[PDB]
Amino acid sequence: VLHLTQDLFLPFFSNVTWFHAIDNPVLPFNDGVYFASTEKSNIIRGWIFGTTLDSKTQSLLIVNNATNVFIKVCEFQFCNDGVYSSANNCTFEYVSQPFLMDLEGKQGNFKNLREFVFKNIDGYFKIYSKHTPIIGRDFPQGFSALEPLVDLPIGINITRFQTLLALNRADYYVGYLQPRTFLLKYNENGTITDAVDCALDPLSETKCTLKSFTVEKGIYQTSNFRVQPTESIVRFPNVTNLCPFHEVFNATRFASVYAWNRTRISNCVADYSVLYNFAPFFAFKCYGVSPTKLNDLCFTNVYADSFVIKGNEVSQIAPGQTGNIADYNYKLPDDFTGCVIAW
Amino acid sequence: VKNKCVNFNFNGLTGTGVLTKSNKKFLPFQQFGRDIVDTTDAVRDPQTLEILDITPCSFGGVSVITPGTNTSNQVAVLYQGVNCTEVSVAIHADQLTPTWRVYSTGSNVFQTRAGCLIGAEYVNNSYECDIPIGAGICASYQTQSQSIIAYTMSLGAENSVAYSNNSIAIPTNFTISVTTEI
Amino acid sequence: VKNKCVNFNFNGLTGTGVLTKSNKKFLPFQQFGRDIVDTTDAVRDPQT
Amino acid sequence: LPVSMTKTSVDCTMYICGDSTECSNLLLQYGSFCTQLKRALTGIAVEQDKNTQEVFAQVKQIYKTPPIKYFGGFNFSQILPDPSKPSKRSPIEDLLFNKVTLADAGFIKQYGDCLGDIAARDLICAQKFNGLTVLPPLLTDEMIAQYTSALLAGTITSGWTFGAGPALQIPFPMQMAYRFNGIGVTQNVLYENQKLIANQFNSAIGKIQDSLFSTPSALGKLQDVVNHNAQALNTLVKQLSSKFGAISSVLNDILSRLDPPEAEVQIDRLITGRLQSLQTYVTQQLIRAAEIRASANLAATKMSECVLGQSKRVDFCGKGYHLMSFPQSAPHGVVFLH
Amino acid sequence: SKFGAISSVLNDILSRLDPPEAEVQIDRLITGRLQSLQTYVTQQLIRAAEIRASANLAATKMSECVLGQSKRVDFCGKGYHLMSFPQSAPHGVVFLHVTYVPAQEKNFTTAPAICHDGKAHFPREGVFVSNGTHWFVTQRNFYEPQIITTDNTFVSGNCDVVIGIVNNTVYDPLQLE
Amino acid sequence: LPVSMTKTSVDCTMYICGDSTECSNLLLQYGSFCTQLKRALTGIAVEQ
Ligand SMILES: *[C@@H]1O[C@H](CO)[C@@H](O[C@@H]2O[C@H](CO)[C@@H](O)[C@H](O)[C@@H]2O)[C@H](O)[C@H]1NC(C)=O
Ligand SMILES: *[C@@H]1O[C@H](CO)[C@@H](O[C@@H]2O[C@H](CO)[C@@H](O)[C@H](O)[C@@H]2O)[C@H](O)[C@H]1NC(C)=O
Ligand SMILES: *[C@@H]1O[C@H](CO)[C@@H](O[C@@H]2O[C@H](CO)[C@@H](O)[C@H](O)[C@@H]2O)[C@H](O)[C@H]1NC(C)=O
Ligand SMILES: *[C@@H]1O[C@H](CO)[C@@H](O[C@@H]2O[C@H](CO)[C@@H](O)[C@H](O)[C@@H]2O)[C@H](O)[C@H]1NC(C)=O
Ligand SMILES: *[C@@H]1O[C@H](CO)[C@@H](O[C@@H]2O[C@H](CO)[C@@H](O)[C@H](O)[C@@H]2O)[C@H](O)[C@H]1NC(C)=O
Ligand SMILES: *[C@@H]1O[C@H](CO)[C@@H](O)[C@H](O)[C@H]1NC(C)=O
Ligand SMILES: *[C@@H]1O[C@H](CO)[C@@H](O)[C@H](O)[C@H]1NC(C)=O
Ligand SMILES: *[C@@H]1O[C@H](CO)[C@@H](O)[C@H](O)[C@H]1NC(C)=O
Ligand SMILES: *[C@@H]1O[C@H](CO)[C@@H](O)[C@H](O)[C@H]1NC(C)=O
Ligand SMILES: *[C@@H]1O[C@H](CO)[C@@H](O)[C@H](O)[C@H]1NC(C)=O
Ligand SMILES: *[C@@H]1O[C@H](CO)[C@@H](O)[C@H](O)[C@H]1NC(C)=O
Ligand SMILES: *[C@@H]1O[C@H](CO)[C@@H](O)[C@H](O)[C@H]1NC(C)=O
Ligand SMILES: *[C@@H]1O[C@H](CO)[C@@H](O)[C@H](O)[C@H]1NC(C)=O
Ligand SMILES: *[C@@H]1O[C@H](CO)[C@@H](O)[C@H](O)[C@H]1NC(C)=O
Ligand SMILES: *[C@@H]1O[C@H](CO)[C@@H](O)[C@H](O)[C@H]1NC(C)=O
């Protein structure tokens, strides 16, 4: 069968940053990372992922050992190099068969090549592997399937990628996947003998259209082509009305607490730039409505009560509060949604 | 940003395309614009009170002309019904939706009445049709050393008869041809 | 029961058909199986 | 006789879901429902190209008329191509072109002047806007006239011999006399009244031009075909404005009013409405393509019988006893001068 | 194809959803598959109509070209049709059109008629062809020149209206005896 | 040899919405979906 799939895959003939080992650059982790390594016996122990790589956000370490693995989704403190230090707010300790297959034909020339591709779409970290003591020159050309080893639903956030090393007394192939459509050739034994991209070469695209590996002489309509817009201009009527926010924040006899002096707001425009640039401010507490994600909200009516009080009463004005001003003169409702201004 | 593809959201009217100055006769009350088939075509500027036309973004279509895969992997790309300087500047600005790119060496560009062919070179010689390109053009795989060449139709062997007042050609011999029809 | 027309509810996959031992090459992580056109064709026995 | 119509290569994604990722993803849930449409339209275009090839490329050799034109007194300047005309077409094909107006030429590359259309954009710009495009015929209108010219040169310089094998030159009076012999009258009646036959032929050839010029519509078949394609495209692009029993006919508007979790029902409604409309359009195009294939096969048979020979069947090559038939290229069709 | 429903498997959606909520997705699958089947049968009807037209053409071709000789030029193969063998094919028929196609030809000369004695002689069946010196009559499709005898022609005219006539002598087997 | 059949002039409003104002209004929301149908049937009668 020549099944066609749309999935995050490493683009064919893409750019891979081959590295060496003799300090651990922080490779970004976006849309997963494809990793590979060729080694004589072993130079690699474990990987680290996550953001800021500290005991602040949950991260991942996939270190192994001679007989098993030591993968753990933990929030380790720091190692900067016995590696881990903190296991307090950490869970998900997993042990299974080791990730390294090592074999030799009575000689060290049988350099094993390992191949690991990762992604964390809706969590579920995936590790696909296939080991082969290939010719050993470098990243080879002959195709090879990639069998999964483990499937663990991590359910955390990951953004970066680094790697641990080994001890002593050519590897680190890194690739980035992109959202592409792929076509896979399935052998009669179920293996994937060949695969072709669908967005790299026009021949590949037409091969993908007719789900085949052979194209006869002729012309094939594959898809359409569009010029994606460069910018995105939004235009609205020159300019409309303005609410008397300036007139209500720039009066001369703001009535005190005994006359709450409310200016009802209707058929206005909620221009809150004046609310920001006006006055150095002293109390800008917002409870039910965000003080920045509010210009996108449309209201029916708005009530603004202008008061004059002292510093202690400024903090006293708050939901569920008691005192000389919060219970006898002006009470703030518990279910109040809005903002307060004090300058 | 006129004469350039750009998303627009004019006073609640959202869409994509290209805009430029127009010589419309929009009435002062008029705000939107359309055509016979009720597709938005003109929009008055809500901040300049000017009239701008609306264009399709770059609509065309990609067709790949290729010989047998066992013959060669060389392919040529056809973009139907768009001007080829337009597609070239789209490629230069890197805003074309296709990500695959066929090399533009200057020689492999052929503005054809069916859209310009890229990946094939025009030859002024005429050969029989092999792959129908359209607008009297057919592409084929030929030796120079091997590439895809686009050419006009060879309608056939040019022949001139010897008609005269008193000239007749009479077949002194004959052949028997067993044609096949399926 | 094999070589007989039975209703099956294998691991939540319900349906009707005839089952028999096959000569496919399921990889240890493969569970459901399919045919050319996207339909459950061969389900490996989770027990034996 | 129509031979073909405007080839179309309607696309799925732009037409149904205008540059909308979520709408394209929802359409992907329908499987290869529209790849069938693309394949059917491609097959229709291929069939129309084959129709033109069968109806015109009946001769493997492009014959040329002799530089002098005196065919026993028969006047052929009306049907032989005029060298002075840049298109190298006879006055008959010139009148045919001038009497047929194409809503969509297709081979215009109209993109670029749609912004410069200034006025309300026409059907072409609208259809390019809403996912509609038109492919041009493989055989250009110039080389179709070239095939017609080669056929005319063969049929007026070599009789029907070039339709069977090698072109054997023969005087035109002799050829007409042999047509008379084939129609059951001996060549003597022609050879005694050659002047009268030539004068009648010239009068008829002159008067058919005036009949075509002054008639309201003698190109009714071709004009009806072109109008049918134009009206089908117009209805196709008009169905985009139909609500189809949903909140709105604007894909952006339905999203900007209902969050896709509650808007996917209306998205599916628009999807199925536009899919059914395109299905109807494609089925009607298939039906019209079958009818056009039948008409073009009839035209090809008429060519191979009346042009490259004389047909004993009556009425087939015009009313009365058939003598000849001189083809003339027409927009998306052929015209026989029986 | 999920057709905008939970899943494309009838049994799985039945086993995962109750009847009085799953019947909506059931109807969605019903209408999607039913429209697909309608499209398939419509396209099959198109194809069957085209195949019926082709088969009627094939039957006519068989009846004429096979069971006889068709004077319709360019119908039973290119060239003058002689006879044809039908051959069975998978879901089709293959004809073997045996056609008579002319060959090497020569310009000789031609005249509409021959004027022996004040009278215009026209050929009975054939052309008036000239070696270059001696006029002859022969069949149109094969160069078989023969002496211009009275039996080979028929005379009707007055040697003054046939344009292009030439002077030559016609012979008869009667005057000798 | 058949020459023609009975000519049909199916009517959208009546067939799909028996004298119902709201039904006709809803059918109008489907665009000119059936005007094509009426034109096709008229052309069929003309062809007969
Ligand atoms: C699928 O798996 C089969 C079982 O190993 C393979 O059959 C074998 O083939 C080898 C030769 O390659 C024989 O020596 C052995 O006896 C057995 O028949 C079969 O080849 C394989 N199919 C593939 C790899 O395509
Ligand atoms: C007509 O054409 C025939 C072939 O199409 C000629 O037959 C040929 O005869 C030669 C011997 O002279 C053979 O060697 C050859 O294989 C072929 O059979 C035939 O001679 C020719 N007749 C005339 C009069 O030209
Ligand atoms: C063949 O018929 C032509 C008809 O178009 C003749 O052309 C005519 O030319 C005269 C002037 O010479 C014009 O007045 C007339 O309108 C027409 O164009 C052409 O002469 C004629 N040739 C012969 C040899 O009869
Ligand atoms: C005209 O036709 C004549 C047939 O009678 C040809 O004459 C022949 O010539 C040979 C000698 O070459 C005679 O032996 C024979 O009896 C016959 O007369 C003659 O070649 C031909 N002329 C041309 C130009 O073809
Ligand atoms: C064919 O032969 C006729 C007599 O056998 C010729 O008629 C003669 O023509 C001359 C003029 O050339 C007259 O003066 C004479 O009275 C007689 O009518 C005829 O011309 C000739 N034609 C050709 C074409 O040779
Ligand atoms: C990879 O990067 C190099 C420069 O670092 C660039 O020249 C090359 O074109 C890139 N390859 C691809 C396939 O983009
Ligand atoms: C390696 O890791 C496994 C996993 O738990 C552990 O049991 C073992 O003691 C470790 N050390 C060796 C030498 O295997
Ligand atoms: C573990 O992480 C959580 C997440 O923020 C944090 O609240 C908690 O204090 C951490 N515990 C430590 C670092 O011991
Ligand atoms: C109030 O308005 C006056 C004039 O309208 C202006 O001069 C003054 O700066 C304003 N007050 C504040 C605090 O901006
Ligand atoms: C739009 O408003 C700006 C801001 O005052 C003004 O300068 C410009 O002239 C206005 N243009 C129109 C067309 O109203
Ligand atoms: C398209 O063709 C060329 C190339 O761009 C140029 O003349 C112009 O852009 C357009 N011309 C016409 C006639 O459309
Ligand atoms: C060769 O091709 C060029 C461009 O395609 C053309 O200008 C030139 O006339 C051609 N030469 C001949 C002899 O036709
Ligand atoms: C045929 O005859 C006419 C008039 O007699 C003459 O003008 C023309 O040149 C002749 N052509 C040939 C080929 O003899
Ligand atoms: C019980 O479950 C285990 C788990 O694989 C396995 O031995 C088998 O499925 C069951 N044992 C039986 C059926 O004897
Ligand atoms: C007839 O004469 C013309 C005059 O040049 C010549 O070109 C042609 O080949 C001749 N036909 C033959 C020899 O069959």
Side-chain angles (χ1 to χ4, degrees), chain A residues 55-56 75 88-89:
Chain A
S55 173
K56 263 193 52 202
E75 201 188 79
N88 34 70
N89 53 6

Side-chain angles (χ1 to χ4, degrees), chain E residues 14-168:
Chain E
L14 265 283
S15 96
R16 87 192 276 168
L17 248 63
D18 57 55
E21 177 38 34
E23 75 286 42
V24 177
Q25 323 281 1
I26 286 306
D27 156 78
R28 207 90 74 75
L29 263 278
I30 279 285
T31 192
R33 284 153 173 225
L34 202 43
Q35 200 214 341
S36 190
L37 209 46
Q38 194 36 279
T39 300
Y40 162 76
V41 58
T42 284
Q43 296 228 359
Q44 267 294 298
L45 265 152
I46 287 329
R47 210 79 43 75
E50 199 276 342
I51 289 299
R52 151 174 277 288
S54 162
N56 273 341
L57 165 65
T60 289
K61 212 171 283 276
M62 158 91 77
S63 285
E64 313 189 340
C65 322
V66 184
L67 321 185
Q69 162 172 119
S70 181
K71 319 299 199 190
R72 294 161 58 179
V73 51
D74 219 318
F75 189 47
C76 319
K78 264 194 53 163
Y80 302 106
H81 166 238
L82 283 187
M83 52 177 278
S84 73
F85 312 115
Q87 298 293 274
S88 174
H91 304 337
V93 76
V94 160
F95 287 105
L96 259 59
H97 289 313
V98 174
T99 67
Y100 169 93
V101 164
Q104 44 203 30
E105 66 275 32
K106 330 168 49 195
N107 314 349
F108 304 97
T109 304
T110 166
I114 293 306
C115 181
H116 185 33
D117 300 303
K119 303 171 303 180
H121 296 276
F122 304 82
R124 218 193 279 278
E125 301 305 17
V127 303
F128 272 149
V129 79
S130 147
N131 57 352
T133 58
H134 309 151
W135 277 97
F136 288 125
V137 63
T138 182
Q139 326 142 330
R140 298 139 217 184
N141 329 99
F142 197 83
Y143 182 44
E144 191 74 11
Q146 283 175 305
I147 309 308
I148 316 165
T149 79
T150 285
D151 290 82
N152 289 113
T153 177
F154 73 100
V155 66
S156 75
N158 259 359
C159 195
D160 45 3
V161 298
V162 188
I163 317 185
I165 201 171
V166 306
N167 267 353
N168 196 241

Side-chain angles (χ1 to χ4, degrees), chain D residues 11-108 110-251:
Chain D
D11 196 345
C12 310
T13 296
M14 181 165 328
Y15 166 60
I16 315 151
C17 300
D19 76 346
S20 290
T21 48
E22 78 300 337
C23 194
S24 44
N25 293 330
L26 194 139
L27 176 58
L28 274 184
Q29 264 189 343
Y30 273 35
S32 80
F33 220 132
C34 86
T35 303
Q36 269 195 298
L37 302 182
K38 188 159 61 59
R39 206 195 327 281
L41 283 173
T42 289
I44 288 324
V46 160
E47 176 156 8
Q48 302 213 16
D49 260 341
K50 165 130 181 173
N51 257 6
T52 37
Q53 212 89 18
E54 242 171 33
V55 83
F56 277 131
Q58 302 272 356
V59 282
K60 72 198 143 320
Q61 268 194 6
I62 303 304
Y63 304 98
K64 278 209 318 162
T65 173
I68 55 102
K69 281 146 205 48
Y70 170 70
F71 310 95
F74 291 82
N75 184 300
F76 269 155
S77 50
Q78 287 281 106
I79 60 173
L80 265 66
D82 167 47
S84 63
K85 267 150 205 63
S87 186
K88 280 196 78 62
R89 297 185 321 244
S90 322
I92 311 300
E93 300 117 345
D94 261 15
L95 304 190
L96 290 194
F97 257 32
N98 300 354
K99 283 203 83 191
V100 174
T101 58
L102 300 180
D104 200 320
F107 39 82
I108 175 60
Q110 184 153 329
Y111 186 88
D113 56 71
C114 287
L115 48 95
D117 198 283
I118 281 158
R121 77 194 183 217
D122 60 349
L123 292 321
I124 330 301
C125 289
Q127 78 191 247
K128 302 316 262 307
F129 198 85
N130 48 43
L132 272 283
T133 194
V134 162
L135 315 179
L138 159 74
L139 289 184
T140 83
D141 306 321
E142 199 282 298
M143 42 195 298
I144 280 177
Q146 181 78 6
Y147 272 132
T148 286
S149 169
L151 283 156
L152 218 42
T155 205
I156 87 163
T157 63
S158 55
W160 58 95
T161 62
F162 82 117
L168 326 169
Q169 68 266 38
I170 165 169
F172 200 70
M174 286 210 32
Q175 174 187 178
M176 194 79 42
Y178 285 1
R179 313 262 198 175
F180 273 15
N181 181 25
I183 196 52
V185 65
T186 66
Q187 328 161 22
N188 75 323
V189 68
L190 176 144
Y191 284 134
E192 303 146 21
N193 323 126
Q194 184 170 340
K195 271 305 184 315
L196 300 182
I197 291 165
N199 272 355
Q200 289 180 21
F201 192 100
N202 299 357
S203 280
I205 276 296
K207 85 168 50 164
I208 170 177
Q209 160 155 337
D210 301 357
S211 85
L212 282 195
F213 214 80
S214 277
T215 188
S217 53
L219 286 318
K221 296 222 189 62
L222 317 170
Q223 201 68 22
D224 283 27
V225 155
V226 171
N227 280 347
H228 284 184
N229 328 112
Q231 160 208 115
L233 293 187
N234 277 24
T235 53
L236 209 176
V237 306
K238 192 167 299 313
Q239 293 286 341
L240 274 206
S241 76
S242 52
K243 323 300 291 311
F244 275 133
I247 320 296
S248 154
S249 189
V250 180
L251 201 284

Side-chain angles (χ1 to χ4, degrees), chain A residues 64-102:
Chain A
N64 95 96
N65 75 345
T67 57
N68 277 89
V69 306
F70 268 116
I71 178 174
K72 40 159 170 300
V73 185
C74 166
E75 201 188 79
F76 29 64
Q77 195 266 120
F78 256 123
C79 175
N80 225 326
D81 271 324
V83 153
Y84 88 116
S85 36
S86 275
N88 34 70
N89 53 6
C90 302
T91 42
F92 198 162
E93 172 45 49
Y94 174 119
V95 162
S96 83
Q97 275 311 285
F99 287 143
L100 59 103
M101 301 325 88
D102 46 347

Side-chain angles (χ1 to χ4, degrees), chain C residues 3-26:
Chain C
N3 323 55
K4 196 165 324 291
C5 158
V6 200
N7 296 297
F8 52 85
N9 196 346
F10 268 123
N11 306 356
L13 161 60
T14 173
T16 320
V18 192
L19 301 96
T20 171
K21 163 67 154 165
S22 174
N23 179 10
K24 278 189 163 66
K25 302 275 106 172
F26 259 63

